[PDB]
Design an enzyme around this catalytic site. Structure first.
Site, mmCIF file in Angstrom:
data_model
loop_
_atom_site.group_PDB
_atom_site.id
_atom_site.type_symbol
_atom_site.label_atom_id
_atom_site.label_comp_id
_atom_site.label_asym_id
_atom_site.label_seq_id
_atom_site.Cartn_x
_atom_site.Cartn_y
_atom_site.Cartn_z
ATOM 1 N N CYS B 106 1.528 -1.478 0.081
ATOM 2 C CA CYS B 106 0.104 -0.258 0.057
ATOM 3 C C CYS B 106 0.774 1.117 0.320
ATOM 4 O O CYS B 106 1.940 1.533 1.053
ATOM 5 C CB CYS B 106 -0.697 -0.157 1.486
ATOM 6 S SG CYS B 106 -2.354 1.419 0.962
ATOM 7 N N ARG B 109 -0.254 4.707 2.482
ATOM 8 C CA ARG B 109 -0.202 4.319 4.164
ATOM 9 C C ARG B 109 0.300 5.597 5.029
ATOM 10 O O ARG B 109 0.429 5.291 6.287
ATOM 11 C CB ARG B 109 0.668 2.932 4.405
ATOM 12 C CG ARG B 109 0.172 1.511 3.868
ATOM 13 C CD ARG B 109 1.243 0.582 4.813
ATOM 14 N NE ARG B 109 2.478 0.837 3.719
ATOM 15 C CZ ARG B 109 3.291 0.128 4.252
ATOM 16 N NH1 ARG B 109 3.740 -0.420 5.150
ATOM 17 N NH2 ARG B 109 4.241 0.147 3.055
ATOM 18 N N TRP B 278 -9.205 6.173 -0.795
ATOM 19 C CA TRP B 278 -9.612 6.703 -2.372
ATOM 20 C C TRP B 278 -8.174 6.442 -3.127
ATOM 21 O O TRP B 278 -7.285 5.597 -3.009
ATOM 22 C CB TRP B 278 -8.827 8.294 -1.882
ATOM 23 C CG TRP B 278 -7.737 8.560 -1.353
ATOM 24 C CD1 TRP B 278 -6.811 9.479 -2.451
ATOM 25 C CD2 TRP B 278 -8.393 9.491 -0.723
ATOM 26 N NE1 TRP B 278 -6.030 10.001 -1.508
ATOM 27 C CE2 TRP B 278 -6.105 9.895 -0.474
ATOM 28 C CE3 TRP B 278 -8.707 9.382 0.762
ATOM 29 C CZ2 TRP B 278 -5.624 10.234 1.389
ATOM 30 C CZ3 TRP B 278 -7.900 10.002 1.610
ATOM 31 C CH2 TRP B 278 -6.788 10.268 2.116
ATOM 32 N N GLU B 283 -4.199 3.954 -11.052
ATOM 33 C CA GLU B 283 -5.097 2.416 -10.638
ATOM 34 C C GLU B 283 -6.277 2.786 -11.843
ATOM 35 O O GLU B 283 -6.482 1.515 -12.391
ATOM 36 C CB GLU B 283 -5.938 2.514 -9.346
ATOM 37 C CG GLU B 283 -4.544 2.608 -7.883
ATOM 38 C CD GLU B 283 -5.444 2.214 -6.952
ATOM 39 O OE1 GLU B 283 -5.618 1.352 -6.809
ATOM 40 O OE2 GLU B 283 -4.827 3.556 -6.393
HETATM 41 C C1 HEM Z 1 -6.540 6.731 1.108
HETATM 42 C C2 HEM Z 1 -5.791 6.485 0.357
HETATM 43 C C3 HEM Z 1 -4.808 4.980 -0.421
HETATM 44 C C4 HEM Z 1 -4.132 4.671 -1.591
HETATM 45 C C5 HEM Z 1 -4.080 6.306 -2.288
HETATM 46 C C6 HEM Z 1 -4.132 3.401 -1.512
HETATM 47 C C7 HEM Z 1 -3.280 2.594 -2.953
HETATM 48 C C8 HEM Z 1 -2.950 1.788 -2.726
HETATM 49 C C9 HEM Z 1 -2.670 1.090 -4.243
HETATM 50 C C10 HEM Z 1 -2.028 2.000 -5.611
HETATM 51 C C11 HEM Z 1 -2.080 0.020 -4.147
HETATM 52 C C12 HEM Z 1 -2.251 -1.086 -4.840
HETATM 53 C C13 HEM Z 1 -3.187 -1.519 -6.204
HETATM 54 C C14 HEM Z 1 -3.805 -2.308 -6.574
HETATM 55 O O1 HEM Z 1 -3.410 -3.186 -6.141
HETATM 56 O O2 HEM Z 1 -3.263 -2.806 -8.120
HETATM 57 C C15 HEM Z 1 -2.860 -0.194 -2.383
HETATM 58 C C16 HEM Z 1 -2.733 -1.595 -1.623
HETATM 59 C C17 HEM Z 1 -3.258 -2.128 -0.686
HETATM 60 N N1 HEM Z 1 -4.143 -1.319 0.501
HETATM 61 FE FE1 HEM Z 1 -3.821 1.156 -0.093
HETATM 62 N N2 HEM Z 1 -4.753 2.724 -1.023
HETATM 63 C C18 HEM Z 1 -5.159 4.564 0.750
HETATM 64 C C19 HEM Z 1 -6.086 3.324 1.316
HETATM 65 C C20 HEM Z 1 -5.983 1.808 2.005
HETATM 66 C C21 HEM Z 1 -6.740 2.308 3.182
HETATM 67 C C22 HEM Z 1 -7.693 2.902 3.750
HETATM 68 C C23 HEM Z 1 -6.239 0.583 3.765
HETATM 69 C C24 HEM Z 1 -6.594 -0.619 4.949
HETATM 70 C C25 HEM Z 1 -7.772 0.563 6.084
HETATM 71 C C26 HEM Z 1 -6.032 0.055 2.420
HETATM 72 C C27 HEM Z 1 -5.113 -1.021 2.288
HETATM 73 C C28 HEM Z 1 -4.695 -2.052 1.355
HETATM 74 C C29 HEM Z 1 -4.440 -3.151 1.346
HETATM 75 C C30 HEM Z 1 -4.386 -4.349 2.371
HETATM 76 C C31 HEM Z 1 -3.826 -3.271 -0.253
HETATM 77 C C32 HEM Z 1 -2.273 -4.456 -1.144
HETATM 78 C C33 HEM Z 1 -4.097 -5.605 -1.025
HETATM 79 C C34 HEM Z 1 -3.245 -6.505 -2.248
HETATM 80 O O3 HEM Z 1 -2.145 -7.044 -2.389
HETATM 81 O O4 HEM Z 1 -4.061 -6.927 -2.679
HETATM 82 N N3 HEM Z 1 -5.485 0.573 0.998
HETATM 83 N N4 HEM Z 1 -3.247 0.151 -1.830
HETATM 84 C C1 LIG Z 2 -8.568 0.786 -0.258
HETATM 85 C C2 LIG Z 2 -7.895 0.672 -1.042
HETATM 86 C C3 LIG Z 2 -7.345 2.088 -2.468
HETATM 87 C C4 LIG Z 2 -6.587 2.452 -3.407
HETATM 88 N N1 LIG Z 2 -6.248 3.401 -3.952
HETATM 89 N N2 LIG Z 2 -6.952 1.212 -4.525
HETATM 90 C C5 LIG Z 2 -7.537 -0.083 -3.719
HETATM 91 C C6 LIG Z 2 -7.144 -1.611 -4.865
HETATM 92 C C7 LIG Z 2 -6.191 -1.862 -4.272
HETATM 93 C C8 LIG Z 2 -6.527 -3.308 -3.922
HETATM 94 C C9 LIG Z 2 -5.657 -3.639 -2.836
HETATM 95 C C10 LIG Z 2 -6.478 -4.682 -1.970
HETATM 96 F F1 LIG Z 2 -6.656 -4.886 -0.923
HETATM 97 C C11 LIG Z 2 -7.190 -5.343 -2.943
HETATM 98 C C12 LIG Z 2 -7.582 -5.083 -4.065
HETATM 99 C C13 LIG Z 2 -6.959 -6.464 -4.544
HETATM 100 C C14 LIG Z 2 -5.669 -7.757 -4.950
HETATM 101 C C15 LIG Z 2 -5.772 -7.591 -6.908
HETATM 102 N N3 LIG Z 2 -4.322 -8.437 -6.272
HETATM 103 C C16 LIG Z 2 -4.199 -9.573 -5.857
HETATM 104 C C17 LIG Z 2 -3.744 -8.867 -7.440
HETATM 105 C C18 LIG Z 2 -6.531 -4.149 -4.789
HETATM 106 C C19 LIG Z 2 -7.640 -0.021 -2.140
HETATM 107 CL CL LIG Z 3 -9.724 -0.669 -9.266
#
Ligand code: HEM
Ligand SMILES: Cc1cc(N)nc(CCc2cc(F)cc(CCCN(C)C)c2)c1
Ligand SMILES: [Cl-]
Ligand code: HEM
Ligand SMILES: Cc1cc(N)nc(CCc2cc(F)cc(CCCN(C)C)c2)c1
Ligand SMILES: C[C@H](O)[C@H](O)[C@H]1CNc2nc(N)[nH]c(=O)c2N1
Ligand SMILES: C[C@H](O)[C@H](O)[C@H]1CNc2nc(N)[nH]c(=O)c2N1
Ligand SMILES: [Cl-]
Ligand SMILES: [Gd]
Ligand SMILES: [Gd]
Ligand SMILES: [Zn+2]
Lengths: 404, 402
Positions: B106, B109, B278, B283
């Protein structure tokens, strides 16, 4: 056997070749250190073990494992080490090992070419002037008036006691890096240090930001000596943009031949601290990393002002727009100068093809995702969506301490 | 003997001492790195819980106190009699925040401390589950001024099945198979789309049809719920200078709300705990719209731009994707919906890395997920080495309920 998926197509393969990965990498079950540029840090009984391994797959390759000189070649190495401590490689083995090491480079995206490599045997050289002549033959052959040809020159193997051959520059062609009143740098900041060593070894400094540095070449024990590169041997491409008329006026250039001259070649447990290899550029290397890196030429902003872009807010994507045009200029200029270059889309597509070939041939391929994915437009290339397994095979190119 | 980490843009060097605390094991060995792979009882519940309680009482500057030891004694007593335990509310809120803080992939964070935690642990049914979710979406969206939030449904517990949200996100567009063997809509969502249909949903025929929710109460089949149209804020996409762009009819939704991950806190498992933030513009612009296996609009945009698509060396792909991202940013800003571009986001993630080094002696980060899918080395995270590892509390993947 690790399962490897491609997320664009949904296809699955297994990397069985990883099972024979020895020289352990940086990672543990508790933490991944994949992103690290240099993993960690940089009784002759061991030498034989690596030698038998190397000889064994040489004959596997050319079919004749079992009977014949395969039998025979094994004892000569045994006898050669028993008698002298080290051993010498057959010319064909040197060739086979050099290609294999390139084949095994996890961070190289151009390995579809690994079969086409010209190996110059320089193990009979014993002087700095001799190295210089060997290097100059290489450069001339590799450059080939712009029709670039992959080449490696292999200097004598490291011997126990008494020093090594060694090129002090990181590449054969490197631009000057000059400190100053503000401590800032005119030229290439990556090369400021070797520029420092060049001057304190008797090199007259220069004009500005594209002075081709001299070579600091080193024969065993006897300390390094400067060698100036012939201008006509150093092919360069002035940078112009196909439609942005003012780009030429920025006075940017890059050289034609990427030739890496500080890595240690390991074949059959033997070490060649001087084995410069060369290929041709992928355009992002020049256009994105060399010119646009904050700690390199850092030109991004200057090009954006020329394009009258809105540098007041990141969300205009002015960095992105300027980067693409800098890359477009690199490709256009090299093409105009008829110098071999490959764009990151073509290169990555070829690497995908290389993956499939290697799957059938060896059951997998060591690839370092972070270095294979291009530094711009990563997910627009196929390698982005391809999972990879990274590990160490031999023969290989390794990093090594610098001679100071 | 802690990993040395270098920033190559500046020359910084730090040591990730936090990695040594890694409470779990990932896919890598000395033999091979598998870093690029996307998918990597009482006594053990006890030691997990004991470590989280230690964490909680550290965070409130109350480590080793009577209140601390009392809570430890309460927890291992409650596991003795029931085989489990319950989080206090403040522990739940802390736990959910840490889970975000601990998520290696993420980039957002820097925000981890600003998280609205909705406690739905008293949720009783799917219908109630739906109400909780609707309130989440409404609060989080906040008319385009997006707020980070998580809603936590009842924990996995002995004797009863799991609460599950079947949908991978709260908002998704349908993906319909075709006569061409093709897909109309979002190809990532064909499976969930099919499930919805065979659970009674009347499917649409557009490219941007919002899916209904499939919500599973314990030991119940999933139940279909339609989202009120006006609850789902969307942004039609247009480009500031390419007016033909608007005629592509592209849209995306405001709220990224991930709903199929498991939240783990002190050994307790919450199979249903949707969270939302947000969007970062890449993405949407790069991955959702340009991936060949997603909406795949890159070529059609390039042709419209009159780029030369015959040859790769013209960089038509790079040029079209840049404008697609500009379009996304422009459109969201125009619509007054929160969005961050990859430059601001990566810049703030660097500040997070610096905060986290001072705070915890490091920060788990997955380089390949943190570096944006376009313009990687133009962002500061590219030149930053990182250590990937698993800390708890954590968000985990889990298998699909079907
Ligand atoms: C508020 C602005 C936030 C931004 C800009 C953001 C951005 C991102 C991005 C760009 C990714 C990876 C993109 C992708 O999977 O293609 C990501 C992954 C992730 N985010 Fe954040 N996020 C935000 C909020 C949050 C919140 C509020 C949570 C949880 C309480 C969170 C938890 C996670 C987790 C667990 C992943 C990785 C999961 C995975 O690998 O599938 N995010 N985030
Ligand atoms: C909470 C949040 C904020 C943000 N800016 N973008 C997201 C979507 C990214 C994302 C966050 C997430 F936690 C899980 C996934 C789907 C899993 C995809 N992998 C297995 C290939 C996607 C989630
Ligand atoms: Cl998405
Ligand atoms: C012929 C066309 C070639 C292309 C397009 C190419 C491309 C690349 C690129 C882009 C990198 C990334 C490294 C960086 O950015 O620092 C790389 C690395 C590497 N290449 Fe190639 N290369 C070519 C030829 C060769 C040859 C001929 C050899 C050896 C005989 C070779 C061996 C290596 C090795 C060992 C690395 C590792 C880089 C490192 O560890 O620092 N390559 N290549
Ligand atoms: C042979 C070759 C082909 C090509 N297209 N590009 C190159 C240059 C990339 C490169 C390749 C290489 F193997 C070594 C280096 C220098 C060391 C980089 N790290 C340790 C900081 C650079 C080399
Ligand atoms: C920190 C990060 O691992 C480092 O900057 C790497 C990432 N990938 C790279 N890839 C290539 N080809 N060249 C590089 O210098 C780097 N740098
Ligand atoms: C195989 C590779 O790891 C995979 O395609 C990753 C690469 N980096 C990513 N980075 C983000 N943020 N999101 C992703 O889905 C991916 N996909
Ligand atoms: Cl270079
Ligand atoms: Gd002007
Ligand atoms: Gd226009
Ligand atoms: Zn790893």
């Amino acid at each position: 056997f690790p399962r490897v998926k491609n997320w664009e197509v949904g296809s699955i393969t297994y990397d069985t070749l990883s099972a024979q990965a020895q020289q352990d990498g940086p990672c543990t079950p508790r933490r991944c250190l994949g992103s690290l540029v240099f993993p960690r840090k940089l009784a002759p009984e061991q030498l034989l073990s690596q030698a038998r391994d190397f000889i064994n797959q040489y004959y596997s390759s050319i079919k004749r494992s079992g009977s014949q000189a395969h039998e025979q070649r094994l004892q000569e190495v045994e006898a050669e080490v028993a008698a002298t401590g080290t051993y010498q490689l057959r010319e064909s083995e040197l060739v086979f090992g050099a290609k294999q090491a390139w084949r095994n480079a996890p961070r190289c995206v151009g390995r579809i070419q690994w079969g086409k490599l010209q190996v110059f045997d320089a193990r009979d050289c014993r002087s700095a002037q001799e190295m210089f002549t060997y290097i100059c033959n290489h450069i001339k052959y590799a450059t080939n008036r712009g029709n670039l040809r992959s080449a490696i020159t292999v200097f004598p193997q490291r011997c126990p006691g008494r020093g090594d051959f060694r090129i002090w520059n990181s590449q054969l062609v490197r631009y000057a890096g000059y400190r100053q009143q503000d401590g800032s740098v005119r030229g290439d900041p990556a090369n400021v240090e070797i520029t420092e060593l060049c001057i304190q070894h008797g090199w007259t400094p220069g004009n500005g930001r594209f002075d081709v540095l001299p070579l600091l070449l080193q024969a065993p024990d006897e300390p390094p000596e400067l060698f100036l590169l012939p201008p006509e041997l150093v092919l360069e491409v002035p940078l112009e943009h196909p439609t942005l008329e003012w780009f030429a006026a920025l006075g940017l250039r890059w050289y034609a031949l990427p030739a890496v001259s500080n890595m240690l070649l390991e074949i059959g447990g033997l070490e060649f601290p001087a084995a410069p290899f060369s290929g041709w550029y992928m355009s992002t290397e020049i256009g994105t990393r060399n010119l646009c890196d904050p700690h390199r030429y850092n030109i991004l902003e200057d090009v954006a002002v020329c394009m009258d872009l809105d540098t007041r807010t990141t969300s205009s994507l002015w960095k992105d727009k300027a980067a693409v045009e800098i890359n477009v200029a690199v490709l256009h200029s090299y093409q105009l100068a008829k110098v071999t270059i490959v764009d990151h889309h073509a290169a990555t597509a070829s690497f995908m093809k290389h993956l499939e070939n290697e799957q059938k041939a060896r059951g997998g391929c060591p690839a370092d995702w972070a270095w294979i994915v291009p530094p711009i437009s990563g997910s627009l290339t196929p390698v982005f969506h391809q999972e990879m397994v990274n590990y160490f095979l031999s023969p290989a190119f390794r990093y090594q301490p610098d001679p100071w």
